[PDB]
Design a protein around this ligand. Structure first.
Ligand code: HEM
Ligand SMILES: [Xe]
Ligand SMILES: [Xe]
Ligand SMILES: [Xe]
Ligand SMILES: [Xe]
Length: 154
């Protein structure tokens, strides 16, 4: 699926991202929660927050951003090892299905926001090959997370 060079393009860009994983990750989630306020129903501490300026200062938001960024870090850094990606993504899916009861589609939506922000951030380093690499990564995330929702009885 993901080629050598495509793996390498994602990984090189992810490293530039992760150098401010904390700012990037909350910016992403703030954007997500601003543009899809329905997604915020699952978070006790900011379900009724509207102000982006407050959302950005929320510890529960910031914690989720840090944990999402950590999981995807595991995925991106280990794209060469398909079994560590399956297991990370299966843990995540199952958790979201059962612990948190999150509709799977919000994964699609969040991923679209991620892609929007990565494109903005690397606008001067986003050639078709690199767009393709990210699109495949996004699609692979959704497959494994979908498969996990089915495995558990969603
Ligand atoms: C790439 C996509 C995502 C990843 C990798 C991810 C990962 C995680 C991780 C590692 C945790 C902490 C461990 C756990 O409690 O399961 C967590 C917690 C949580 N996640 Fe996500 N998540 C993602 C997307 C989402 C989405 C789309 C939602 C809902 C719209 C969501 C809702 C929650 C909730 C409600 C918690 C518990 C938060 C808390 O206890 O404060 N996650 N997530
Ligand atoms: Xe994120
Ligand atoms: Xe990612
Ligand atoms: Xe990201
Ligand atoms: Xe993504």
């Amino acid at each position: 699926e993901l080629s050598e060079a495509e793996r390498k393009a994602v990984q090189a860009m992810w490293a530039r991202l992760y150098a401010n994983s904390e700012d990037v990750g909350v910016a992403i989630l703030v954007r997500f929660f601003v543009n899809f306020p329905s997604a915020k129903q699952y978070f006790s501490q900011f379900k009724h927050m509207e102000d982006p300026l407050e959302m950005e200062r929320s510890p529960q938001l910031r914690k989720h951003a840090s944990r999402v960024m950590g999981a995807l870090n595991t995925v991106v850094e280990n794209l060469h090892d398909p079994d560590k990606v399956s297991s990370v993504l299966a843990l995540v899916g199952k958790a979201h299905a059962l612990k948190h009861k999150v509709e799977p589609v919000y994964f699609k939506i969040l991923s679209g926001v991620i892609l929007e922000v990565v494109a903005e951030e690397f606008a001067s380093d986003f050639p078709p090959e690199t767009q393709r690499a990210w699109a495949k990564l996004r699609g692979l995330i959704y497959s494994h997370v979908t498969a996990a929702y089915k495995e558990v009885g969603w």
